[PDB]
Amino acid sequence: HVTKDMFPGPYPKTPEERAAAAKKYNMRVEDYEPYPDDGMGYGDYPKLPDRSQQERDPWYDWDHPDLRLNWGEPIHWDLDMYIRNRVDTSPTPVSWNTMCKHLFGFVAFMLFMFWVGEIYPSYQPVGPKQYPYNDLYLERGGDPTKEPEPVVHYEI
Amino acid sequence: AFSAPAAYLTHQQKVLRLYKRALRHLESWCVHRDKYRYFACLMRARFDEHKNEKDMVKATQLLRQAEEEFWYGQHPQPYIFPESPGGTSYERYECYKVPEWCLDDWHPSEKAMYPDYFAKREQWKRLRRESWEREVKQLQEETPPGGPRTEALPPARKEGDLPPLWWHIVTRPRERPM
Amino acid sequence: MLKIIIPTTMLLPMTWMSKHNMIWINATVHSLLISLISLSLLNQLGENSLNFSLTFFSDSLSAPLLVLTTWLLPLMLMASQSHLSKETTTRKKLYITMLILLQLFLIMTFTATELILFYILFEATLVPTLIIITRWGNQTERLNAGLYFLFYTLAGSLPLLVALVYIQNTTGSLNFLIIHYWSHPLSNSWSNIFMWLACIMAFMVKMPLYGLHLWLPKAHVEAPIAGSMVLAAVLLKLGGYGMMRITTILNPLTNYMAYPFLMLSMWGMIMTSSICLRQTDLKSLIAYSSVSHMALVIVAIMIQTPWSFMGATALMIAHGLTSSMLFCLANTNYERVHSRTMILARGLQTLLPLMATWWLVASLTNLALPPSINLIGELFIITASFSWSNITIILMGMNMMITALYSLYMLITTQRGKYTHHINNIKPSFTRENALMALHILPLLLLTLNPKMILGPLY
Amino acid sequence: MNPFASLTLTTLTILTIPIMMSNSNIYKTNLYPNYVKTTVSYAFTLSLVPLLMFMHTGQEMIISNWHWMTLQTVELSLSFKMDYFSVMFIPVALFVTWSIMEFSMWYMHSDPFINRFFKYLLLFLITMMILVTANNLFQLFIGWEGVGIMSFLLIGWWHGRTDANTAALQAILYNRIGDIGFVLSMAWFLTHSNAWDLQQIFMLNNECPNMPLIGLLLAAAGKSAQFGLHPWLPSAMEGPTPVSALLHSSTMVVAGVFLLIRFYPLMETNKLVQTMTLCLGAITTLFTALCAITQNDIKKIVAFSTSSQLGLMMVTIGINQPHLAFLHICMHAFFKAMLFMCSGSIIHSLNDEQDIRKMGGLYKAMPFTTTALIIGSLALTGMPYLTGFYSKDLIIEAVNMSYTNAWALLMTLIATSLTAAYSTRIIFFAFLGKPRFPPLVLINENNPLLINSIKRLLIGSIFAGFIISNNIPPMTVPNTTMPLYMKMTALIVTIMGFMLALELNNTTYYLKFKYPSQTYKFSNMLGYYPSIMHRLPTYHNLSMSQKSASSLLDLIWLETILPKTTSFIQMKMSIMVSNQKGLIKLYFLSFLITIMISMTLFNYHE
Amino acid sequence: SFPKYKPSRLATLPATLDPAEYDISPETRKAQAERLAIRSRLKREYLLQYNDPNRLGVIEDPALIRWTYARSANIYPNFRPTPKTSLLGALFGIGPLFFWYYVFKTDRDKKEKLIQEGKLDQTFNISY
Ligand SMILES: CCCCCCCCCCCCCCCCCC(=O)OC[C@H](COP(=O)([O-])OCC(O)COP(=O)([O-])OC[C@@H](COC(=O)CCCCCCCCCCCCCCCCC)OC(=O)CCCCCCCCCCCCCCCCC)OC(=O)CCCCCCCCCCCCCCCCC
């Protein structure tokens, strides 16, 4: 029962076309603003605010409670991106571009310190461990027909 | 949740909501009951300091400054009730909620069990079918020609009338349906 | 081979002589019997193929495809009879006739010894599919979908005909045995390059290759349920089978003629997996997942290793079964709510638990959970690609991650959350639908016990 | 025949019997959970015997009972490895699962799908056993994905809740990120060693290159939730408490550590991968311990404790001490399961409340739970001669006495401080002070199931360390000579953590209020890693998936080039050809033109 | 006074920090009333069908159909070949293909030239 003129069309340029488009999407003409008229193909569809579904009021009596949407209302172009199982735009206690500095600084500091500690390792004041039979030459792969160089250990 | 929202919030409503949010976040910060009570009375005093202001502009500026202070000093992990929209048990029992119209698709052998319940359900269905037309007529009568202005619904006004659009409000599955 | 072809032909007068209320029963029973008979072709000799006669032969590659087609016909009949209940007897018989003709053309296509007969049957498969899509499709876009499906195929297939007749003129034969035994290298020349392209592009567009895949979403979404089943399960595999048959004479040119196709296949499998993440139509997501799986099959065929062909055969069989099951699962909900939008009906697990179990198993097989044959084929192809180049693992892992992502996204969107309130016409699942899902899924799991049946000649 | 193989296979086989009976009548009754629990207990008491055989004679075996398929020179067979690792880990996992199912019989009593819950737990146990006992990489991958999928299904148990589905998908995403590296390792091993089985790989890889080891490290980081892929483990607390106690605490999350232990002969031949593992473990354990000390949800704190302990297992792998890592897994299982069990009892008593700010004085109201949690906290902090002592203190000793990265050592010590820090936080905020819960008291822990299960795990957490440490052969060279201050480093660190955390917790009684510091905001919000990494890459990926892949290419440009151009060209040519005015004058003029051309451009050329 | 919070794309501005909701004019109140009236009329239209005992089926939503049509069928009719569109299409279409061709061709050329030298250590590589 959705007739032909209830479907999205081309970009509106005349004020009467904009009024008709705003009425078609159940919006105020003062609120309805389409996407810029490039060749991206948005056409008549309104450019709703880029808020997520998580930011909507959870105490309202929505027609679809999980979706947080009302029947017949214009749906954001990127609804499936903002379904709140996904990308969230909700305001954070700490400003964006402030969390980024802290996170990047922490990771960079830890990486630089790990590299420094690799340059300056920790060890005990001991000599290398000593093994009896030419450093176990026959044990570590064998080849018992090539007379390994004598690895000789002395007591101290 | 149960009340139809208004077109906008008054300054008084915003002030009370900010008061409640500040109190809850202060309780989140002040874990213990005595310290929370002390700082809550301090908050109440600071809040009553500007109780009787008559200049709306300065009251609005005070509200904006208070909101900025709350946002800067809010708890990053405020306490949330388990069933609240942020709680750990918010939508836990939603998978147990089955709509009542599913009972019509039951096999007759399934309805052989529970006979009295289904007889009473038949009574309820007759009631709804016999009230629907009067509900629609009342809604048409009590509505301005330019459509409804708010989401409020009128009550019943006649002898044997039921409030319009009542079936899906009365027949909620449950809060703990299983 | 006549013991399979002749009963399939007999299916036609049998269904044209049946009573108005017995056509589905008779067709299903005898299609199942024909599938049982065709199951006997899996006994393969190893060294060489089974050469029944001059016209037909059976291979370790052809036999699983033949069994899959014969098994798919009864499932198509079971899925069709619900939405065709209001049809007249003559039109239902015509629909079943289209299905039987498609089966006959498919079973003859996979066994032809000579490439012109293979081409003739491989083009003949077009007509019944086109008639089904354009006559029993539901929406008004079925006409445009049919035009796309026909012309995309033919624009690739005609140069193949020219190349085949030229090759027979130059060599003297097109019989696959003579072709294989008298194979000579293709020199590095423009004439040989264009011969390679003419021999490859038809099978490329039937897979479909990324960039030539635009017909597939239209045709698979706009077709009735049986049409989508046969398009995804069997008709996509014609390109792969043709590639495996035809690349025998293309060496050593494939060594560098495959570079653009490998690049297109890898990046386009990434692209289609990403596309599946933002899809509002449930059938289009399944179609694009099919495109990604066939891109992986294209890579496997292009790299020309035994492990690659084994993985490609396993992946073809597994993808056919899984895609058919997924299309049937989507069709059940569409029949319930008469809309293909994914978010229209939500939380169906609360209302249909067994169908939710079928959905979960189909989604698990789509993401290639071990030790299912889907992962057997995918892992073999990935290992062969790693041998081809160690850098392919980045794209393979990205594709695996995105595949799991959209598979579970579809499952969560359709089955979980809370039900839509106003939708109140969701009846309990019928025995027919549950039986159809079980008949899709059980052979998949049973093939895990005997993976060598679908690994192909290189085994 | 030697009873060892038969008993080891029977232990695994009898666990599948309830899965086969899931379609029988017992699944429709209320006796199913008790039946599954009894089956698991019988499996544990049966698995006890091969452990005794190994502890006597060191018996190890591999069983290639069934041949699956052969591809050319490569043979794939159902093969089970029954070395020290399997015969030690199977009884511990069965014991923990037995206790946790007995707990679940009480905790999940009012759930209408308790039978499905127990079936899912049994399926997870079967898949984990397959993962642990696998002898080739394909079977281990089967167990890998089985436990991953079971975790997905159990996290989203309440599928009507959006956050549970989100957390399950997050876990799947991170596990597949690790699975990329797993598949890379499999492909490299097949291509270069012509085998997937463990024995051939060891023989043919004397000097293991970097590629397979980096693949295995990526897989382990994905499965064990290391710093790059950590956030899914804390978010896995969306599932019911028994799921967190069993899967995401002690049994499944150690799969990456176990995978690295399974390949230690190859790992000890490469120092770059060892350094990478050590550094990743150190950053993981300290970051998670830092995040833990500021959390208010008890399950989140215990999950961050689990992540920190996994990082400790990674660092002890990095210093070439795999047997010590396995010992740590076995020891940590007991008291971490007990800690989640105590937290779940507390949550159930206080009307499903998990915030410690509303948990008052339960030291007297819940005596048995308090005792069990105190014992588990002492075991976690390495109190001498407890379960945690015999492994954690040896790990600290070995880290101190090795040629190791200095930063990793320092971060390990700071994490050792933070462990006592958040343990003190949990105890102080949950058991001491005055009540802070709603007035209607429902506190009741007088149920035989809960008491018996917690008691069994308490006896384990008290004696298993000593018994297991004294009943295994020496596989690591002891550190006998070390400086006294360096011997006591772990205890000094633990006491410092105790004292300073207790001081800062005692200072909140004061009637003084101050705004939080930036370091506190960094710690509480998990370093802003979920705030940025869960929003920026996901948004960009989905936006490019829609705008570029779907719309720009398939719907616009691929349409423009092949089909739309053809349609436009043919329409224009048809309009040009067919639009004639029907006048014979023009036609015959064109005929004259054509004749003139044929006689000149063709008739002059012969 | 206190440090200020600045919004971004993925962390938007809170309502209480929005100066727009604290600078109110009668036309703003009229706009809010108009929006509320539109919402109420849509809610009434939906609820009259939701509570209908006679109605059986799915209540069609025009808005959902508009969204799906715009996202699927309305895109090409509103496409124009534009320098922005052309450049973005060319980049996102053929850039990655040539990038991956270069990477794979370089890797395989190195591997093949290293094979011809007799130095790859292909011992035990019998499966491909
Ligand atoms: C002879 C050798 C023996 C050595 C013995 C000891 C050696 C000295 C130890 C002293 C070191 C730390 C002492 C305690 C720290 C905090 C105490 C304090 O003052 O409290 C006030 C305050 C706490 O905040 P608040 O406003 O009071 O909390 C609001 C309410 O109270 C919120 O209340 P609530 O109800 O939410 O809960 C309160 C909760 C939450 O309280 C918090 O908010 C604190 C959270 C953070 C502080 C925790 C310290 C851990 C630091 C580890 C950092 C490792 C390096 C990371 C590098 C990051 C790079 C950006 O507190 C707790 O429950 C426990 C908190 C921690 C207790 C245990 C801490 C001891 C472990 C650390 C020392 C290790 C001892 C053994 C040494 C082992 C090796 C020798 O602390 C601060 O404002 C500053 C904290 C200092 C952290 C510095 C991080 C180190 C690296 C900085 C960057 C370096 C590079 C330069 C920049 C980059 C250039 C490019």
Ligand SMILES: CCCCCCCCCCCCCCCCCC(=O)OC[C@H](COP(=O)([O-])OCC(O)COP(=O)([O-])OC[C@@H](COC(=O)CCCCCCCCCCCCCCCCC)OC(=O)CCCCCCCCCCCCCCCCC)OC(=O)CCCCCCCCCCCCCCCCC
């Ligand atoms: C399988 C995977 C998927 C594959 C398929 C998908 C991807 C492929 C297919 C789809 C994408 C390809 C689309 C092709 C372009 C179609 C253009 C079109 O339809 O126009 C009709 C359309 C309608 O005509 P109209 O209504 O009569 O005109 C009114 C205009 O709207 C009024 O506009 P206006 O007056 O404001 O502006 C017009 C004016 C001013 O235009 C502008 O203001 C913007 C500048 C446009 C021209 C220069 C580009 C500037 C920015 C990038 C510069 C190059 C950067 C480096 C590139 C290589 C980097 C390594 O035009 C110019 O000045 C251009 C002069 C030419 C100078 C540069 C020539 C460079 C040729 C190509 C170089 C790159 C080769 C590829 C390298 C790849 C390496 C791996 O005209 C336009 O509106 C567009 C005009 C601008 C076209 C620029 C095209 C740039 C894209 C690359 C083209 C090369 C690819 C095609 C190969 C065959 C070329 C012979």
Ligand SMILES: CCCCCCCCCCCCCCCCC[C@@H](O)O[C@H](CO[C@H](O)CCCCCCCCCCCCCCC)COP(=O)(O)OCC[N+](C)(C)C
């Ligand atoms: C959307 C998806 C559609 C399907 C995609 C199909 C892909 C088809 C591409 C075919 C792959 C390559 C074709 C031929 C291989 C090499 C091509 C050429 O560039 O290589 C050089 C060839 O040199 C020059 O480049 C000649 C070619 C230049 C003219 C071709 C125009 C290319 C412009 C791109 C047009 C787009 C084509 C596809 C339209 C859709 C090699 O130098 P040389 O060793 O000396 O010549 C070897 C040949 N010999 C032995 C006979 C001498």
Ligand SMILES: CCCCCCCC/C=C/CCCCCCCC(=O)OC[C@H](COP(=O)(O)OCCN)OC(=O)CCCCCCC/C=C/CCCCCCCC
């Ligand atoms: C190596 C190949 C892979 C490398 C990683 C490439 C980037 C991966 C991009 C994946 C994009 C997938 C997007 C589709 C998912 C759908 C949307 C979605 O998932 O929502 C985000 C969802 C909800 O967020 P919450 O905060 O939990 O919400 C709770 C309260 N509401 O959470 C998620 O699942 C997001 C997960 C994004 C992961 C991306 C970051 C991973 C980066 C890994 C790099 C580190 C490597 C490890 C190094 C190990 C050392 C060797």
Ligand SMILES: CCCCCCCC/C=C\CCCCCCCC(=O)O[C@H](COC(=O)CCCCCCC/C=C/CCCCCCCC)COP(=O)(O)OCCN
């Ligand atoms: C729906 C989309 C699918 C599009 C697929 C179209 C590509 C098909 C491949 C090219 C088709 C023509 C191939 C011709 C048949 C091959 C026979 C042959 O090898 O003969 C060659 C003849 O080679 C040619 O003539 C080829 C010239 C090309 C004619 C038509 C050109 C049309 C465009 C060609 C490029 C596009 C093909 C690939 C594009 C794929 C789709 C984008 C040599 O014969 P001789 O003359 O005897 O030489 C040796 C003795 N001197």
